[PDB]
């Protein structure tokens, strides 16, 4: 398996970030990629074995280190906003036809930490018109005013995580696209049957995992420190 670490990280310009990749496939080749809209996947650094690292097509800003056959690490000594992206690590055999990617790491590099806000979450109960018109009930969940867009939305029906009837946006959205530090919003929908919604014993919850600052980080403002947290909103079935 190819696993990366960390999977989310927020940094300030001029700090040193170390993305780190581990692989247990007994593969010899390891690659570091970044994904950005308008550019696809782009190679930063790769390696044929322990002790060696090769420059990719966009190596500026990053150094690589392959201390062993199963470890390949990517290093940003003077982190920069242009290095904010999603990073992917890959492994491969000698002359292999397949790259085996990791799950990714979302990393934001920011001028100031003053614009790190967590999301406000709200559930919106189904309209009675939809119920009486289609015998289905659609709850809509909004997460708003968060930055950056490192957010995962999930629905919980009666203590367990639900998947049927769920559809959420694939990427958040800017609330003010003119500004360069606009906060983001995500929306989701959970559709259940009308007979299920009207039973007031069923409860429905929209949980939003937000990734931000960590413990060792330092916060210098009145507001509570936007740590990495769960933010939920809830609605109860009714009549």
């Amino acid at each position: 398996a190819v696993t990366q670490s960390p999977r989310n990280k927020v940094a300030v310009t001029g700090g040193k970030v170390t993305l780190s990749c581990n692989q247990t496939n007994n593969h010899n080749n390891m690659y570091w990629y970044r994904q950005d809209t308008g550019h696809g996947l782009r190679l930063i650094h790769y390696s044929y074995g322990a002790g060696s690292t090769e420059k990719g097509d966009i190596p500026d800003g990053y150094k690589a280190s392959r201390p062993s056959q199963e470890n390949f690490s990517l290093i940003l000594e003077l982190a920069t906003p242009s290095q904010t992206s999603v990073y992917f690590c890959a492994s491969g055999d000698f002359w292999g036809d397949t790259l085996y990617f990791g799950a990714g790491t979302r990393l934001s590099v920011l001028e100031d930490l003053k614009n790190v806000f967590p999301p406000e979450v709200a559930v919106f109960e189904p309209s009675e018109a939809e119920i009486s018109h289609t015998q289905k009930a659609t709850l809509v969940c909004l997460a708003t005013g968060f930055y950056p867009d490192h957010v995962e939305l999930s629905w919980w029906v009666n203590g367990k995580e639900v998947h049927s009837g769920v559809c959420t946006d694939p990427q958040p959205l800017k609330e003010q696209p003119a500004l360069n530090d606009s906060r983001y919003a995500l929306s989701s929908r959970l559709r259940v049957s009308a007979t299920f919604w009207q039973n007031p014993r069923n409860h429905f919850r929209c949980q939003v995992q937000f990734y931000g600052l960590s413990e060792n980080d330092e916060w210098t403002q009145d507001r509570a420190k936007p740590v990495t947290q769960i933010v939920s909103a809830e609605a109860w079935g009714r009549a």
Binding site: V166, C167, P170, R191
Partner: peptide
């Protein structure tokens, strides 16, 4: 928002609202 993505595990109530 006009193009939600269905949950990969969804089974029973799929619509693209």
């Amino acid at each position: 928002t006009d193009k939600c993505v269905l949950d990969m595990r969804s089974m029973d109530f799929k619509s693209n609202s």
